[model samples]
Every structure is written in structure tokens, then in C-alpha cells.
Target chain A: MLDAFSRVVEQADKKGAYLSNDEINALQAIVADSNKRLDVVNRLTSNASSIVANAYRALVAERPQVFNPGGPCFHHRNQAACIRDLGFILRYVTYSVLAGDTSVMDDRCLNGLRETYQALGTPGDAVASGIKKMKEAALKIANDPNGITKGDCSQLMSELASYFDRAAAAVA
Target chain B: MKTPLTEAIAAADLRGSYLSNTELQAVFGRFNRARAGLEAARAFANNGKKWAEAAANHVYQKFPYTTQMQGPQYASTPEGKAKCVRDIDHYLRTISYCCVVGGTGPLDDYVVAGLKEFNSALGLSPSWYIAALEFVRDNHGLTGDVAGEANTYINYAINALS
Candidate 1:
């Protein structure tokens, strides 16, 4: 867990010496697991964004009167902004997690991402499920970096993709 | 410009309400601008190392501190100053990504927030941060809306300092 890592760092600082080999190895192992989780999330984020954009395009085509530039439901700009911002936040979280700095992964950043995801206005269980899975995966890694395995991360990725797939199908 | 793939998608749309050539061209133009912004951000990250070094020297000259100022007391140390610069670089990268995604507002927010955080954390004056941002704006060849937004933040920082 992060608490244990923090203790290790504090001990090293107190000793006025560089981290011991064992400490370095332990941190590296945790970082590697976190990186694996980050990789899966990155792919899911990209896939979900593409699916949402395509769905938006389809909706705009079908209902230009409502979803066009001046239409009542015209929010392509917001949608795109949210997706872009979310991507940046997620990427930054990955970096912070890797560096063992959990301060940047605070509620503000997470809430911002959640709000952005909600702004996309997609239907089906996929949108909600995908966000839930991502949040869970990220928190899990942050809480216990060594606890998650590659297989666990892979399973989450599969579940995340399935949600997006279902959402895309519903839109189509 | 609409890639062949996008054009095909538009052509095959059921409602035939795809983007026109002009619209597609405009989109492509924006895309290019975004790409330029990202390139500028990368350049800033590379140049920021030297900038941070110079800034650290300036700080050391202005506020003479004894003992290693690492750890929590990082405000007056080379390492702390470098960290501040790296943080700004991160924000710039975020803004660049926002630009690529057609999100100017978030980009603006990131710049403003980044400047404030750097100033507060480093105990640097608003003018200091403003000047740094201006340096980036000038060097990056940012123009039009993006340039305007950067200037707005610069001006805000200046006013706050005043």
C-alpha cells in the first residue's frame, strides 16, 4: 500500500542515504503494476472517445434539426472538450501514480474527469460501467499497487472494452 | 482535411449529412494548429530545463539560504525550482492536448491555474510567472485564439502581482 511506500521513503530520508536496493526493487515492482493498469486505461479511454465521437456523428446526421450547430441538443463542442480534458487528467494521474505522488490524484481531478464523462451524453450501460471500472481500477492501484496483477488489470481492460462496445452498439 | 477514411464515413452516412469539403478543410486546419501547439509545448519542456536553471540561480542570488533546501522546505533550492518548472511543463502539455481536442476553455483554465500554482509554490512574483508564460507564447509562435488566451492569463497574472 501507499502508506508502506511512504514509510520506506521517510526511512530513507531519515538515513540521509539513497534508497536501499530492496526498497528500490519494491517500488519498481509496484510501479510496473501501476504502469500495466495505466496502459489498459489509456486504451479504454481512446476507444471510448472514438466510439462516442462516432455516435455523435451518427446522431447529428439523423437529427440535424436537434443536434446540428444551432440545434437544441448541439453539444459536440462540450463533448469533445470533456473527452480531451479527461484524457489529460488520466494521463497525469498515471504519471503521478508512477512517481508515487498521490497528491495530484485528489478528488478535484477525479471529479473533473467524472463530470466530463457525464457530459458526453451517451446511452447504454457501457458509459457508466466503463467509468466505474476505470475509477475502481485506478483506486485499487493507488491504494495497493502491489495488490493488482497483470491478469487483474487485463480483466478490467476487457470489462471496460465490453462496456464501450455495448454503448457503441446501442448508439448504432 | 477529411482523411480518406473520414470521407468514406461521411459518404456512407445514412442521412447524407456529412461534413462538406470546406468544413472538413476547416477541421484539418484546426488539427494542424493543435499539432503546432503540441510541438510548441514539447519545445517548452526541453527549453524549460535551462530556464529553471537560470531561475534557480536568480533565486539563490536574491534570497541567500543556508543548508540543503530539499524535502518539505523546497522553496529556495535548485531542486524545488526545477520541480516548479517541471510542473509548468506538465500543465503546458495538458493545454496542448486540450488544444488538439478542440477545447480552448480547458486550455485556458490549465494555463491560469498552472501560473497561480507555480507562483504560490515557488514564492515567485506574478510578473515572474507572467514573463515565463510570455516567453513561451513568443517562442511558440502561437497566434489567433490560442495566443489571445495565453495573453489573457499573462495579463491576469500581471494584475494579480500589481
Candidate 2:
């Protein structure tokens, strides 16, 4: 699940150790920081389906040959697989993101998924290109920290972008 | 704040639990780099005064007008130098915490968030803070043949505060 600010205080009660004013004030700020953390991850999570779907849409738009009769992204079976793999990539990225580093996606999702990459068909360029599409769309959504209290998400956003680049580079 | 820190806090908040030994150990089971990082840790712990001297000189050398300032970097002397000692100690405490905990979580949660703003608000430069951490990492370990290997912990502070 997720953490809440109040929950810690409640747990502390079970031990009869009450947090002092200074500590509580610190938690208040910690709560604020987590809110931004929650904000970005939430954007990625809720928009997960769309983030993947539209990237494929953009990929298809850019490379219409993908939808050709015999192309990797064309037939029903291949089409479903292509979209499914893209979604998986997005899912792992979100996971990598919240995990504090890119190694998870690289070590687990990115490594063995060579099958999926190969499954998407031979021209590694298209696969690589489509991955960037996925990357770009995800960034577009997460990068803009609007409507939420502003933060220097620059570092976090930069880290997120690198994950996409990491994925794209592996297949290419 | 990085995602791991947020998630830990969030998970605690969500479950009505605070961070526990079980939960901390859950952070992917970091293999103790104890031997790997001991030189720097030992170096830092062994010579507290060396760090203070190194950090003070480093700050004056790298940053301008810092020593001449009132509240933070310098004061004509003690209470003025008080912040410098306190700030360096804050850096020291967190570094020591990371060394003991065997993870960067303490620094990530304790110092990383709002770091840039903290510096900016105080009219302070991040480099000075960074320089202090480097002093502890680099030539500041003047007591022995110290390796710049303290980087594992120092780098976390460098990455955030920078």
C-alpha cells in the first residue's frame, strides 16, 4: 500500500511514545514532500493505460508500415502483443521509478523482455523508435507539474527520462 | 525526495505503521558495504576537529563572502562560527547515519528534499555545502592514508545538496 502522515503517529501511540512539536512539524514537511512524490507517481499510475496506448498510436502514426498486412504491429495477434508489451514496459518503468533506481527495470523487466522485443519483429529500429514514443509520452505527462504545488521535480523527472532512454538503448 | 523514501513513508502512512526494522530490511537487502566504506567512516569519526578545520578552510577557499557573513557561514567568531559547526555537524550526523544504516535512506529522507530551496532561501550556495562534504571525503581525512572511498555516503550528500 502507501504511507500516510497520520499513520505514524497512530503507531507511536501503540508504544506510548508521543511525537513532540518539533518532530511533528518535521513530519508536516515530510508529508508535504511525499505529497509531491504521490502526485507524480499517481499521474504515472492513473495514466498508465493511456500513456502506453497513445505512444503506440504515435508510433503507428510515425511508421504506418507497422500496420501493413504483414508488419509486426499489423495482425490481430501481433497487434495485441505489441500493445501488451508496450504496457508492460510502461508498468515496469513506473515500478523502476518508485523503486528509487532503474536497475529493477533493467535487471528484471528489461533483461528477459528481449523476447518481447524480438517478438515485436526484427527491425530493432522500429522497436527502439516505438520505445522512445512510449518514453516521450510518459515524460510529457509526468514532467509538467501543473495544478499541484510546484516542486523541483527536475531531478526526479530527469531520472524518469533516463529510464526510457535506458530501455530504448538496450534494444537498439 | 526520491521515490524509495516517499514510498517508505507512504507505505508507513498507508498502513498506520512507522518505519520498522522489518520494513527497513525490506529495502532490497543492501549488502553491507561495511568493509568497503570503513576507511572514510573511520577517518571521519576519528578526527572530528580535522573535518571542522578542513571544512572551514574549504568553504572560505571555494566560496566568497561566506566567512564575512553574519548568521551562517561565519560570524566575527564563535556563535558566528556556531552555524558552520552546526551545519557541518548536520552533514556529519547524516553521513554517520548512512554509514550505520547501510543505506542512503537517511540522507534521502533527512536532507535531500528542499535542499536547493534551503540554500537559496538562506542566500547560501550549494557548492559550499558540497565543499564541506567533499572536505570530509577528500583531503579532509588528513589523519591517515584515507581513500576518497567515502564517496558512497558523500556522494549521496553531494548529489542532493549540490
Candidate 3:
């Protein structure tokens, strides 16, 4: 699955069809920036996935001590945070990508984000609340500020990190 | 032999998640040509990001300007901005012309939607624009007098998107 995903992602530059609108083009530019961050989140997700899988296997193999504080358990302690962060970043990127939709933001991108949160096994309230805040921020930036300046965009990214931090600490 | 930074940016280009193929090829070509140190290569990537964003926004109505040269040409400062505003104005006027030429169709719908988004972005009362649009709808045309509205629309649209 990862390999196939990689193959298609590798061709992102060439694969997508052209859009005529200038607004759509700019939206896509933002999407590209979001995708760059998504690449990082995905990489971290892969690392955490491997760590958990290995830990589970070791436990089954009679290495119960390995799951203790003195072993890789502490590492797993931080894994939840990584997963939460991954989920959050994916939500933001997908939301922004879909928000550009002229038809409706809810239909195309928000649903995908909701599904992603569910698949990640995230708490419903946490995901929905976070999305609500993010959606508010994004719309505010778009409408009130009338532009998402680099500074505000960076702040939003930090907010995402902070959310993951809280989730990680809670799980730990 | 390439350092992590060099490899990272190259990998980023190769990953090509959001970039167009034409731009990616240009980046790869530059990467090959320079093959500079990590710092320089990193700078190159940053520069590329800035340039690409500016260019894309100019086309996407996210920038209140246009490409100065109608054909392929590099964007400079204020001139590019002027061109962008001009182009969007042209589109708006074209829609007004349509209101006179014939009746409504998919093209008019496109203009209406574009204007809607543009007006909403500008902090303008979208009702005013909607009212104007209604006038066009009622009369089966506008008087080809969308200069002020189009200019405001272009500015708002670019600011909103950018």
C-alpha cells in the first residue's frame, strides 16, 4: 500500500489536470505548500507505525519487559502524539484544499478529513472541535483579513503542533 | 555524496506532491546545474517556492496583477500586478458584453460565481454586487460599465486568495 501510494505521489507534478481559473491556480499553490508539510507528517506516521508494530510483536514474543519504562515503551509513549499530529496536519491540509471548492467545502474535502480522523481512531470531540477551530481560523483569515499572510499561516501550523502535543501528553 | 539538505530538496522536487511538472523539470534542471552546497541548495528551494507561489497567484486571481507580457514573460514588480488587475477586469467586462450579446449560459454563470467570490473577499457588501448583477439579469445586459466593480473585484479576489 505504501509503495503504491508513493508511486502515485511521485507523479503529483505531472498527473493532475490543468485548471483555468486564477483563483483555482492560487488555491493549488497553497495546496502545494500544504502537501509539502503532509510529506513530513506522513514520514513521521510511517516511523510511529513501525515502532508500534515492532513493540506489539516483541510483547507477543515474551518480551513483556520491553514494554516497560526501561525499554522502548517510553518511545511508544510519544507515538500517540505523533499520530495525533499526523492526523491534525492531514485535516488542515485536506480542509484548505477542499475549501477552495466552488461547489461546497463540506462535500469534497471536509468529509475526507472526517473519515481520516475516524480511521486514525481519534476521539470524535477532539477531531471535530479542532476542525471547528481551524475552519473558523481559516475562514476568518480568508474573509476578515482577506488574505492568509505567511505569519498567520505559520501560527496556524504551530497551533496544529500544540494540539498534537496536548493529545500526546494526555495519552502518555 | 549529496548532503541531507541537498537530498531533501531534491527528494522534495522528486516527491513533486504539489508542483506542476513544468516547474518541477525547471527545478530539477537548476538542481543539476548548480549542485551547490546544502546552504545554497536550501536557499534555491526557498527561492523556488516564493517564485512559484507568486506566479501561480498571478494567474489564479489571487494576485491583483497580471503577467505584463501577454505571451511568456518573466514577472517583475508593479507591472506584473497591473497586468493581473487588467486581465481580471477584461474577464469581468467580457461577462457584461455577454449580457448584451445574447442571453445567459454557462459562461455567464462562471462570471457570476467569480464575481461573487471576488466581492465576498473584498469586504464589500455582496448584496450590492448581486443587485448590480440583478440589474443585468433584468435588463438582459449591463452597460459595459464594470470598470470600478471589476477593479474592486480584482483587488479583493487577489487579496483573498493570496
Candidate 4:
């Protein structure tokens, strides 16, 4: 994925390399389409999370002891982290739903997004750094509209899709 | 009674004499493996995360009415069970990874400092220092001896990092 971004960056560095008139029209169409796709995906992700949250709530209510055995063994510690992470994911999606923000694909929103993410799990250094890098990249792209090449947009969308895939797989 | 047995056996006329010391040790040694096997089986049985998330959608799809549930008190369907397991597994994998890499801040600092950031992010009170001591105590069955050691290690890491 970084390789793809590097190639795009190289192409973007050339003089007068910005999108041409026809390219701008094409890019607008693509961006508009991407926005629609984001809306659909966001809605589906939010709805699924809501259901999981509900089911989890019910289970915990009926048997809190089952969930919290008070043992700090590997099992309980990890399980607790998962519970926290899921809550954050649910909230992150909720914010998107309420704001209906297209720029969620942008950097600023995704930067502080970790507060929500860490709520769901224990992020090792790698995951934490990866997230930080993602936020930085997103912010750069957002700040410099021309900085995002066609390839950049495509790769970003691809990553967004894969992320949803992982989430869905876990929930599946 | 015809006779009183000193030791109980599966089938025997119990008498004052029990298995000899050598025989007793041998018998226990033979059964120890079985105890270990039981523990392994228990761990496998309790571990389930990938399946929970996958199966949960069915209930949500058909029984939309189940959406009202809240924190910790959620569904218990097969899907729900599988999801709880999956999420926990992912979180643990993440934690284990951090333990290996030392910390995000510096390679010189021990792993515990990095782990504390994780605990902080999760809003875990008492911090990872306290929780980790408890974690070792519970896992190692040290009966309070290791908690102090764990704390000592935690303090050392903090001092080094600072």
C-alpha cells in the first residue's frame, strides 16, 4: 500500500501534473461516487454495530459474572480489551452517522479516531504507529487537495474497504 | 463390620495399610498427565472470537427487535458468543505484539511502559502497573509473593523511561 502511495506521489511531483480540465471532471465524478459509497458503507457498518452492541448488552445484563470473572489471566485481560474496542468502534461510526461527513476519509477526523479505536482493543506499538501514520497521510491529502492523485484516491478507498472487511469478518 | 479398611480403593477390602510411599508417588505421577490434558481442553473450549461476530448478523437480520440491549447485557446466541471470543482474541494479539516491540517511545525502555499507554487508552483505573501485578499474581498462582516483584519491575521500567 505504501508502494502504491509512493508511486502516486512521484507522479504528483511533476510540473503542471495537476488534474486537467477533463481529468478534473472525471475526478469530480469519481469523488462524488466515492461519497455515495461512503454513505452506504457507513450506514451498513453503523447498523451492524448497533445490533452487536444490543446483543452484548443483553448478555452482560443477564450474567455479568459470566463476563467479568475477576481473573486477570490472559483470557480476561484480552476479553476486556475487546469489549472496550467494540464500544469505541460503535461510537466512531455513530459520529459519522450523525455528522454525515464526507471528509471522514480525510485526516483530522481519523487522527483523534484512536481514542475510539483503543477503546475497542489493546493496540501494540505497531498498530498504534500504523494508525498514527494513517492519520498523518489522511491529513496531508486533505490539506493539499491536489496532493491526492487518482491512484491515491483509489488506494485510500481500497484500504477503507479492507478495514471494513476485517471488522465484518470479526463480527461475522 | 467384617473389617475396617484404612485406605479407600475403587474395589478392595480396605485395611489399615495404604499404598506404599513409592506406589503412591507412582500413582500420582501417572494421573498428573491427565490433569494437564484436562486443562488444555478447557482452554480450547473457552476460546472463541472469530465465530461470534460472523454468527451475530443472523439474529440482527431476522430479529431486529433485539437491538434495545445495552452494555455487557447483550445477546447470547451462538453468533454473540463467537463475537465476544473474536474481539477478545484480536485485542490480546495486539497486546502481545506490544510486549515484543518494547515500546513506541524508545527501544531502551522495557515493554511495560508501552503496555501502560494501552491500559490508559482503555480507561483502566489503577493503571497497568497495578493491573499487571494482579495479572501475574492470578496467572502464576504466586499467592501475593509475585505481585511485589511485578510492581518492582513496573517501577524500574517507569524510572528508566523517565
Q: Rate residue A130 of model 3 by lDDT.
A: 37
C-alpha lDDT score of every prediction, in listed order? 0.41, 0.60, 0.33, 0.37
Higher-ranked by DockQ: 2 or 4: 4
- Return the clash pairs for model 2, or none: A2-B10, A2-B11, A3-B10, A3-B11, A3-B13, A3-B14, A4-B13, A4-B14
Q: Which residue runs does candidate 4 get wrong by more than 4 Å?
A: A1-16, A21-26, A32-35, A45-81, A90-160, A165-172, B1-162
Candidate with the larger TM-score of 1 and 3? 1
Per the 3 Å backbone cut-off, how many clashing residue pairs does candidate 3 have? 9
* Backbone clashes in model 1, listed as residue pairs: B1-B28
- What's the residue-level lDDT of B69 in candidate 2? 56
Estimate TM-scores for all models.
Answer: 0.31, 0.44, 0.21, 0.25
lDDT of 1 by residue, B1-162 (tens): 122222322342333232344543443344334334333333433454454444444444444542154436444565666665664454444443332223333334434546567667855555444445445544555555555443343344345444
Tens digit of per-residue lDDT, candidate 4, span A54-117: 4344444444444443422124334444445444444443344323332332243344544544
Candidate number of the best DockQ: 4
Residue B82: error of model 2 in Å? Answer: 39
Candidate 4 lDDT for residue A165: 34
Candidate 3 residue B115 Cα shift, in angstroms, is: 21
- Which is better, 1 or 4, measured by TM-score? 1
